[model samples]
Target chain A: DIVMTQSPLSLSVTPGEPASISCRSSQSLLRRDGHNDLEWYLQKPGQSPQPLIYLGSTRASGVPDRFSGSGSGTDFTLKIIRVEAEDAGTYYCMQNKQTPLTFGQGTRLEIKRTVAAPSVFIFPPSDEQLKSGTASVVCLLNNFYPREAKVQWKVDNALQSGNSQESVTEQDSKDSTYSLSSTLTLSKADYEKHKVYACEVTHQGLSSPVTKSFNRGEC
Target chain B: VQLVESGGGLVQPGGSLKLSCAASGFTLSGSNVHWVRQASGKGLEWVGRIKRNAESDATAYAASMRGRLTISRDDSKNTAFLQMNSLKSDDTAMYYCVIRGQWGQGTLVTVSSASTKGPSVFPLAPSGTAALGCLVKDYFPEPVTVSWNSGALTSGVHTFPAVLQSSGLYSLSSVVTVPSSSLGTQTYICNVNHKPSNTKVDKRVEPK
Candidate 1:
């Protein structure tokens, strides 16, 4: 990995303050093809990556005037003028000088917290789940900001802890949000006795917790 | 004044050599003798110089070569000398002497048994672009050159830096951007010129 050195590995910038970061490439990032092999991207708070600058100092499409990229080749500086609270997240400098594009250890920008809580929902086991020996239910935590959400399953108000499969979190490209699912499977005999199934979410962004319960008429 | 180096010679690692420079058409004692060395295809390095004077000649060496380097002159014979001791394999280079704007045809010095291995060149198309890439890695003395040839097709080329490694070997990469429609069945070659091994490495790609 081409490890480019970046400063301010951890950042705590106040809202509306101008913030700047320095990224130094060990190799010359300018190419003879009139494109600087360097790029700057900001991973918005709990969001996916959004390009700020690339091809040297050219701002990305839809990038604001406040965001500016300066310097050339080996030394580069990415500056954000009057950064807002939404600007809090990890920033990365990517060098595409060769294959296996290497990125600098990301510099994190911290604000107050995640912007919004997740829209949580729990799915009841379908009829197809019946003839089988077990019943499976899914809990979808959609559109959460800044992943690292904690999920717990409950049966009749009692905590059920085991190896419930937690799915890989997916990033929403349109909104740059996070979505994850918790699939809890149980034996048909156990679901017959326990009528109440609840999915409670404990996320940093939320002041109030989200708990969704499902109970079927047959159960 | 015309400056001439002491021709060329091959010296193995850990060996010492004294290189002489002769001046013609003018007196050598009149001007300071500057020494410059170029490592194969690399850039020039002003090693140091010996300034001539009526009293004693003042001598200085580049910090990198100071301990094992010395510059001196002979006024009576109208010549100057550069002595390099305890030389390493990386010291294989061409040495030249200069007085004012008069420069000599440099002498080539190759350190024998320099682990002269050809570079490992690879072909790739990063980001799935029209640009075909060639990566040459791990060669000694740091003077590897890269070129491209795609017959009949007008192509744009870009060669990146030859980064020196801690292991004393060098690594570099280049790209040749061709027309998107030209890659149906045509081949594009990335040619690497490695001087020490006297070998050329060809890495070609023709993805359908």
Candidate 2:
């Protein structure tokens, strides 16, 4: 296995500042197929490590544009643009440049700050869609800071986890704030049994998760 | 680590289906496993999981399928299984297995109600448009294509995607364009290949 080494074991930044980390691979990461099977992860306390970037520079599916991974060969860097307070976490860099993949040590990212919470607006399915059979609702989030946000759907408090799809975290070109959306699809049978749907958003900046619910009958 | 997933093709609504993941280059019991899926142009979905080195308490499932899924392993075969009961239209997705971050190419599991009656091949109005066409309707699967065996006098052929009808079937149109002067010069076999049934329907179309 090719070993991985990361620089700056610990880093601290403020909410409007930038943060970057460097990772070095014992062997050259340029694979025969012309790709560095490199990945970056963030492990927040009380949470499992989640993927941030893969293929050296491409952002993972739902990650915001702020966390960018760039580099080639044995040297790589993960930069957080305009880092937010919620970005504080232990970062891990892993490589599959050779057989038996290796995960590098953690880089502790501590951010000291005051922050902002996300706003949620739930949009109900059209009457025509509901009448036909299938139903879906969209939870639109806006003006969120930190770029680290989590969304969950609850049907009368029972979690409807996998039924919803979340969009990638996007930052405003001018404002730099974050916006995203989560959509919950429901079978007509499920909607008829459950009338109330709740969209809960959890952000590091908020005291508690914010929730917005829509009643199907009310629609 | 390497991960390959199998079990795809077709499934009917309200039915059950099983998928298998054959992993190598690592110990199956000691590795984390994941089942994910995507539609033709849809987003990624985390379907289910099994933690590393844990079997009894190592499993986690998506909320929508918590009670309807069964996950088991075959140590001798070095394979893991994922089966779901009471399927629906939503389950028609590209099923894939993930050994941690390793992903598979994914298989397409199209779900549709297989119609008992086969597709009906009917002649289109060839009195105008300088075209020879065939209309295919009432097929269950959308993997049907149409072609003409003889098209020497043809300019080109145009076919469109099959539309899912409200009747729970699919309908498509295939047209062969030719000059009106030589359009009826010869009889042409309009061949329709319906993949699901492995059957091809041929209708001879001349003019009118």
Candidate 3:
């Protein structure tokens, strides 16, 4: 029997949006008998099994080719190129070579509802290394109540005054609750001339606050 | 594969014999099973059969076998067995275990005493005919061989014959075809060859 795994525990994609489902196996599916006995079945919600593939890559009976299987031996993948309305249900991967039978945990595809931005505030620039051309500072704010929020540098943490660009924020979701991410970008001039910039993640209800700083031309 | 019988013995002409068989290798539900018999000095006879399901069927050998020829099963052990009674000397022969693709060597039952009487003959008129019937007991695994002959020279009547039980018992019946033209004085002998060692014969002549 071949081992199987999938990526993205769950994802949200509107109908018509392109989506991909990948499956990886631990062993090659090729058979020494010259014919691959690996077969795939589709179990729709509350329905019996429907044959998807048999032998190697041959669609069973009336299956369409849109759903294809390719890969051999240990390393193999199952890809569902595009997501369709009828394809909204969960899908699983199966191998026929081994006895008993096994399946991987399912991944769900859903839609997102809320989207918001984090409130940001920057402290006075640091002068720790000013004489040496470097400094650091922090940004603080509160009430960060959004499903997804990213903090960006604002002249005063308001988003309109800063001219410097920032990189993308790392996103994560745990339980139904959410939080905002802080971004910090330092200027080369501030680093070399002992200057500093403020960067932080601001939420709606924090006491002291959470922030980070740039200290020198390199730190 | 085909079944071949081992040896034979004898019993009284009115008694019976029981046989045992062990099946191995493949699952029993997968194939067709048939029991066959061969008269000690004669040809093959098809008694009846326990089909693919291991169920027994009684064939032409049941006439005189009224209270005889029982088939039983021990499914847990995968063994099929046969039981028959009222054996005659002619019920002696070899009984076999058979499947479509394989045949087991048979066990021989030899019985040799004439314990039962013969059938009476019917009278026939010119252009009239009479049907002859010989009853052989528990021939489940073997088919009965029937023939018609007339003259001072004798012919045999047969029933499915078996000889694997204690003493090798067998029962057989035959039909003597009487031509309406020779009705009154022609005598017909019904000879049954049972396994082990038994030949049962009943003599009869046309009625006036």
Best by lDDT: 2
lDDT of each: 0.67, 0.69, 0.43
- Model 3 per-residue lDDT tens digits across residues A1-219: 345665654676644445555556566667986656455544332223345656656776677556776656644444555544454444455554642233444445443323333334343333322343422233332223333334445332344334332222112222112222122334546335543344645443434344544333334
Measured against the true two-chain complex, the DockQ scores of the candidates, in the order shown, are 0.01, 0.03, 0.00
Q: A89-195 in candidate 1: lDDT tens per residue?
A: 67888775653345676787654333667766666554444454546556666666776789999988888787355643333333445566565667787877888
Task: Name the regions of candidate 1 deviating beyond 4 angstroms.
Answer: A8-19, A27-37, A41-55, A60-64, A72-74, A82-91, A95-102, A106-119, A142-148, A168-179, A203-210, B1-208
Superposed on the true chain A, the predicted chain A of model 1 yields a TM-score of 0.64
Candidate 2 per-residue C-alpha lDDT over A1-219 given as tens digits, one digit per residue, 9 for 90 to 100: 477898888875777889989999987877666668898977653234578988898898889998899989999999998987567667888774533445677787766444567655665554445666766566656656777898889987898866765554323333345556565767778888887888888997779888988776776
Candidate 3 lDDT, B36-59, residue by residue in tens: 554443433444445455334222
lDDT of 2 by residue, B7-55 (tens): 6667778788778888878777777667766554343456777766554
lDDT of 2 at A176: 41
- Structural similarity of chain A in candidate 2, as TM-score: 0.51
Residue pairs with backbone atoms closer than 3 Å in model 1 (clashes): A46-A146
Kindly list the per-residue Cα lDDT of model 1 for residues B95-154, writing each as its tens digit.
878663145766767676455666766554321235455656567654566777633433
Name the regions of candidate 3 deviating beyond 4 angstroms: A33-35, A109-219, B1-208
- TM agreement with the true structure for every prediction: 0.39, 0.37, 0.26
Output the lDDT of residue A200, model 1.
93
Root mean square deviation (Cα) for candidate 1: 20.4
* Candidate 2 segments whose C-alpha is farther than 4 A from its true place: A1-53, A56-219, B1-14, B20-34, B39-42, B49-60, B71-80, B94-117, B123-133, B141-159, B175-191, B202-208
